[PDB]
Amino acid sequence: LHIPVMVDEVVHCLSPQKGQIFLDMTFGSGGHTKAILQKESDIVLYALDRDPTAYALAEHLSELYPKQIRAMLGQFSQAEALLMKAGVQPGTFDGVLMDLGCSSMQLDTPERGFSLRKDGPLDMRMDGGRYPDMPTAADVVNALDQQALASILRTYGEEKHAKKIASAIVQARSIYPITRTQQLASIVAGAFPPSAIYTRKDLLQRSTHIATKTFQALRIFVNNELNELYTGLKTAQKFLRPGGRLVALSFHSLEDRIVKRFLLGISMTRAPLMWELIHKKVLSPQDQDVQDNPRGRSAKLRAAIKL
Amino acid sequence: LAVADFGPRDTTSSSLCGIDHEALNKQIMEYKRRKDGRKRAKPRLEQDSSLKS
RNA sequence: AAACUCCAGUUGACACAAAAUAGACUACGAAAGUGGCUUUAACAUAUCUGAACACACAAUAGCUAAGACCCAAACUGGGAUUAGAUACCCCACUAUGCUUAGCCCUAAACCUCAACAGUUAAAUCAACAAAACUGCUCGCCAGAACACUACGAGCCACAGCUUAAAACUCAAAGGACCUGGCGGUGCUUCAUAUCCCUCUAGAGGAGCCUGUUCUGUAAUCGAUAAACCCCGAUCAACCUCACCACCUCUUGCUCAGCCUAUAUACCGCCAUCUUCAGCAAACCCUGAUGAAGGCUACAAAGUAAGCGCAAGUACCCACGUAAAGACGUUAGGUCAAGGUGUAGCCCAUGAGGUGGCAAGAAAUGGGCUACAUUUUCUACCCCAGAAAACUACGAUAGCCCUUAUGAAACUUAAGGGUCGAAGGUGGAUUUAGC
Numbered sequence: 001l002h003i004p005v006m007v008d009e010v011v012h013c014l015s016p017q018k019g020q021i022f023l024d025m026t027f028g029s030g031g032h033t034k035a036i037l038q039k040e041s042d043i044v045l046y047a048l049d050r051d052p053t054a055y056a057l058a059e060h061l062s063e064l065y066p067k068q069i070r071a072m073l074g075q076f077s078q079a080e081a082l083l084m085k086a087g088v089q090p091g092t093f094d095g096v097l098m099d100l101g102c103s104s105m106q107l108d109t110p111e112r113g114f115s116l117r118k119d120g121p122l123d124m125r126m127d128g129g130r131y132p133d134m135p136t137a138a139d140v141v142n143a144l145d146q147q148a149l150a151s152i153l154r155t156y157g158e159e160k161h162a163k164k165i166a167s168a169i170v171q172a173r174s175i176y177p178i179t180r181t182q183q184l185a186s187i188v189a190g191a192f193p194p195s196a197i198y199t200r201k202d203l204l205q206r207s208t209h210i211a212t213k214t215f216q217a218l219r220i221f222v223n224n225e226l227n228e229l230y231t232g233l234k235t236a237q238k239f240l241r242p243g244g245r246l247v248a249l250s251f252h253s254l255e256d257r258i259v260k261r262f263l264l265g266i267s268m269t270r271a272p273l274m275w276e277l278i279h280k281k282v283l284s285p286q287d288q289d290v291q292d293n294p295r296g297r298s299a300k301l302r303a304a305i306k307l
Numbered sequence: 308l309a310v311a312d313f314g315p316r317d318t319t320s321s322s323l324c325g326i327d328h329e330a331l332n333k334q335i336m337e338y339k340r341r342k343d344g345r346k347r348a349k350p351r352l353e354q355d356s357s358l359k360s
Numbered sequence: 361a362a363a364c365u366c367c368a369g370u371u372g373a374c375a376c377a378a379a380a381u382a383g384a385c386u387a388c389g390a391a392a393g394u395g396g397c398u399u400u401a402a403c404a405u406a407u408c409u410g411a412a413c414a415c416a417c418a419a420u421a422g423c424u425a426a427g428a429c430c431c432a433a434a435c436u437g438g439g440a441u442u443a444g445a446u447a448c449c450c451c452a453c454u455a456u457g458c459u460u461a462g463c464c465c466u467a468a469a470c471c472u473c474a475a476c477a478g479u480u481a482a483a484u485c486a487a488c489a490a491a492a493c494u495g496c497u498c499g500c501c502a503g504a505a506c507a508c509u510a511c512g513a514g515c516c517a518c519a520g521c522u523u524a525a526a527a528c529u530c531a532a533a534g535g536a537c538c539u540g541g542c543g544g545u546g547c548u549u550c551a552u553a554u555c556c557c558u559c560u561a562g563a564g565g566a567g568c569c570u571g572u573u574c575u576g577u578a579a580u581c582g583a584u585a586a587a588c589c590c591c592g593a594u595c596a597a598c599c600u601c602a603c604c605a606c607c608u609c610u611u612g613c614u615c616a617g618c619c620u621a622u623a624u625a626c627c628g629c630c631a632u633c634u635u636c637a638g639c640a641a642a643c644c645c646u647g648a649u650g651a652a653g654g655c656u657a658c659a660a661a662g663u664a665a666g667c668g669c670a671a672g673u674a675c676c677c678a679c680g681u682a683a684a685g686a687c688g689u690u691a692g693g694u695c696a697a698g699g700u701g702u703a704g705c706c707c708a709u710g711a712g713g714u715g716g717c718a719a720g721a722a723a724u725g726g727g728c729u730a731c732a733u734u735u736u737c738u739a740c741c742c743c744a745g746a747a748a749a750c751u752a753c754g755a756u757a758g759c760c761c762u763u764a765u766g767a768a769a770c771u772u773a774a775g776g777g778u779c780g781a782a783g784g785u786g787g788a789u790u791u792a793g794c
């Protein structure tokens with residue numbers, strides 16, 4: 001089981017109260033969405049996700065609360081249009097909870113292709129076939145040249161040896177198609193000597209697979225999470241009420257950079273800033289909680305109020 | 308400044324990310340359309356035959 | 361009015377903290393240290409040397425106990441920064457820095473110069489530092505690393521200090537200097553179409569033309585940062601042709617042949633700095649005759665043939681533009697101009713014939729034509745008349761026809777008809793011009 005990351009902080013931070021309407025741009029499993037519908041029984045909430053499986057969960061969970069939760073499906077960019085069809089263009093949303101990253105269910109189910117440890121089709125796509133033409137990670141690795149493929153790993157994955165892990169993929173694809181997660185992991189791990197398979201260690205000084213970050217890179221480029229994160233934050237601001245508390249959760253510093261600067265009005269690469277950081281601190285969950293849920297160790301919560 | 312006359316007084320987010328996500332997305336889609344060291348001697352030790360000649 | 365306020369300014373009171381200026385002085389003490397004022401006590405030795413351990417000392421940090429606490433400040437917390445920042449930056453605060461009494465006994469504790477005595481004549485002297493040496497004595501050293509380590513022993517020290525090896529391993533380790541390279545290296549002057557700004561027209565967006573890349577194909581090759589990319593080609597329908605498939609020939613157009621490998625064996629011809637001014641034979645002198653160095657014009661060791669620059673010549677001048685431009689740099693480009701060293705093929709890696717390849721899912725370089733009113737069309741070659749937004753501007757593109765060349769043309773070029781698209785002057789960035 002996966003406990004919602006920093007659920008206690010996010011609930012206190014948004015202080016859901018009667019007469020307030022809230023939005024959730026990443027319903028996913030719904031642990032955070034349900035923790036918010038428990039504190040305030042009179043709350044009004046809107047949900048959204050890129051995964052139709054995640055949107056079905058919300059629809060099934062809508063039975064628990066008929067109207068307090070409203071389920072929606074679509075990307076961050078398509079969220080404004082989807083919500084504009086409802087007609088809440090001003091929105092006056094008291095808070096927008098923009099949780100980020102991959103869902104626990106998405107990466108716990110091997111079929112979805114997100115887990116390198118297990119054996120599933122190399123999808124790595126949050127989309128659940130809602131757009132059957134959306135390229136999957138397998139297509140990205142088999143099509144892009146070394147120079148192009150390196151860029152994805154170098155930036156999205158923070159891959160220092162971008163040229164090395166990219167050449168191996170180009171050679172492997174020519175011999176046979178790259179269609180499975182374990183196949184990709186072996187291809188990336190072959191770039192380095194056999195010792196290097198688990199030499200790299202996590203931020204907690206815990207050994208991890210050498211290709212762990214490589215999968216993150218392909219995950220971000222298949223789902224264009226970074227570009228969709230900029231539009232999602234911008235759309236939230238337009239639909240966010242004045243004096244309304246926004247709360248994001250940047251699992252990695254990479255996406256945190258966009259959240260870090262957007263709230264501070266700093267150039268992603270003068271007019272007055274329009275945000276109030278009630279909870280400036282960007283801190284991981286309690287160390288006691290990190291061990292229980294290591295997946296969320298790097299969760300950096302950036303809260304702000306619209307000005 | 309005092310003498311001067313002031314008159315009557317009153318486009319892709321891909322670049323921000325750092326990679327051209329759109330062009331690459333097209334490139335993969337286009338592919339999908341078709342789918343469906345050596346030793347160096349010390350200079351001082353270089354051998355010569357001038358004396359032997 | 362009123363009381364409250366961490367807070368700030370003036371004034372006054374105020375310490376168990378630290379001691380501007382003098383101090384540009386170079387004193388005192390065994391060293392460590394010692395720089396506010398006064399006072400008391402007081403700075404061993406009428407040969408010299410003499411200890412890891414004896415005797416007595418010994419910065420800072422640190423320990424034990426009791427006090428002080430202004431300010432500073434490990435740690436710690438908070439705020440930034442960062443891919444990360446348990447750093448550098450900001451704020452707060454503690455051990456600690458102070459006093460007392462005990463410990464601890466370490467420093468790049470370094471003038472990196474042992475004490476004492478003597479000399480300035482010899483050779484002045486590896487180098488650098490700090491001129492070179494003599495006598496005498498104690499301490500110490502004997503390749504690097506292991507190793508301020510292990511064990512033993514001693515110690516108020518107990519994560520400590522002192523003394524201090526071995527095994528395995530290596531052919532070096534190391535000192536001083538010189539050159540080159542490099543410096544998120546200093547200073548000063550700089551670049552003239554020039555590094556930035558400034559000036560003009562452009563590229564980067566659109567279509568097309570063309571090159572390359574990638575992909576594709578049974579189907580060349582070379583160039584490919586500046587210094588590749590309308591480049592070898594002042595040029596590929598056959599031929600050209602070196603490529604692919606098939607068939608054929610074997611002393612073969614040649615006293616054979618090979619566009620087979622190697623441009624990292626070369627000649628040949630060039631790119632590049634060069635939009636440079638230097639290269640250097642032969643001598644001479646300096647440094648002890650070391651690697652190295654060689655200039656002062658009121659001149660102090662340089663002289664130099666030669667090459668380049670320059671001069672001269674070409675074009676319309678003595679201007680300008682061409683041309684020229686050494687040595688060397690990039691084992692730069694070319695074995696596919698030709699030739700050629702080495703290696704390889706010789707019924708085949710050679711020769712001939714027939715047909716065929718050279719496309720675009722795309723990306724990108726250069727260019728062309730445009731987006732119009734300083735324009736569009738016609739007359740004219742500058743005193744005109746019309747056009748001027750979905751019948752405008754705009755294709756040199758697509759489609760259809762004709763013509764030219766040729767044996768061969770959906771294919772190449774020219775012309776006509778049809779068609780009338782993107783494009784509405786183009787982000788970062790970027791080219792050229794005195």
Ligand SMILES: Nc1ncnc2c1ncn2[C@@H]1O[C@H](CSCC[C@H](N)C(=O)O)[C@@H](O)[C@H]1O
Nearest residue numbers: 026028029030031049050075076102103126
């Ligand atoms: N651009 C995007 N638009 C919408 N949903 C997105 C998205 N990028 C990611 N998501 C989804 O947002 C979720 C983030 S991870 C899961 C968080 C969720 N609150 C939970 O219940 O755990 C995933 O379901 C993911 O598929």
Ligand SMILES: [K+]
Nearest residue numbers: 378379380396
């Ligand atoms: K003083």
Ligand SMILES: [K+]
Nearest residue numbers: 411412499500
């Ligand atoms: K002794």
Ligand SMILES: [K+]
Nearest residue numbers: 468470471472
């Ligand atoms: K010293």
Ligand SMILES: [K+]
Nearest residue numbers: 539540541542
């Ligand atoms: K030097």
Ligand SMILES: [K+]
Nearest residue numbers: 563564565786
């Ligand atoms: K342009």
Ligand SMILES: [K+]
Nearest residue numbers: 623626693694
């Ligand atoms: K040559």
Ligand SMILES: [K+]
Nearest residue numbers: 695698699700
């Ligand atoms: K040749």
Ligand SMILES: [K+]
Nearest residue numbers: 622695700701
């Ligand atoms: K040859």
Ligand SMILES: [K+]
Nearest residue numbers: 708709710711
């Ligand atoms: K042949």
Ligand SMILES: [K+]
Nearest residue numbers: 563725726727
């Ligand atoms: K162009």
Ligand SMILES: [Mg+2]
Nearest residue numbers: 408409410475
């Ligand atoms: Mg004595």
Ligand SMILES: [Mg+2]
Nearest residue numbers: 410411412499
């Ligand atoms: Mg002694």
Ligand SMILES: [Mg+2]
Nearest residue numbers: 412465466522
């Ligand atoms: Mg000692």
Ligand SMILES: [Mg+2]
Nearest residue numbers: 418419464465
């Ligand atoms: Mg002491």
Ligand SMILES: [Mg+2]
Nearest residue numbers: 421422456457
């Ligand atoms: Mg003390």
